[PDB]
């Protein structure tokens, strides 16, 4: 139908929105995880000093 | 041409299925890393009692 055609066009609008939002989120996971790695490397260096005291 | 535009929409769908598969991988990976960080702290705790 011509109504099913019109509806199917609107999803394709949502799809773009979904791509855009998911794209900027995997992109934010990078910054977040890069920061956690700073913390982890800190803890590891800290554990390594507590092991010299053993 | 329209057939050129429909091809892009097909590509857009491929990219979304990808951006969503990776977003899930980020989630599961995140939970594992958080469990890991707690382990490191738990080990720091045990080492400090000495």
């Amino acid at each position: 139908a011509m109504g099913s055609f019109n509806s199917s066009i609107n999803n394709i609008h949502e799809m773009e929105i979904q791509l855009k939002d998911a794209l900027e989120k995997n992109q934010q996971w990078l910054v977040y995880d890069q920061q956690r790695e700073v913390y982890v490397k800190g803890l590891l260096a800290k554990i390594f000093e507590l092991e010299k005291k053993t | 041409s329209f057939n050129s535009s429909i091809n892009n929409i097909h590509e857009m769908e491929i990219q979304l299925k990808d951006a969503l598969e990776k977003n899930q991988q980020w989630l599961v990976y995140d939970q594992q890393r958080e469990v890991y960080v707690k382990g490191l702290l738990a080990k720091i705790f045990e080492l400090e009692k000495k």
Binding site: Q18, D21, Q35 | -
Partner: peptide, 14 residues
């Protein structure tokens, strides 16, 4: 509008 992002951009944000 459903796909997940990180709790923050800084760590931890607790």
């Amino acid at each position: 509008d459903l796909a997940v992002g990180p709790p923050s951009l800084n760590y931890p944000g607790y």
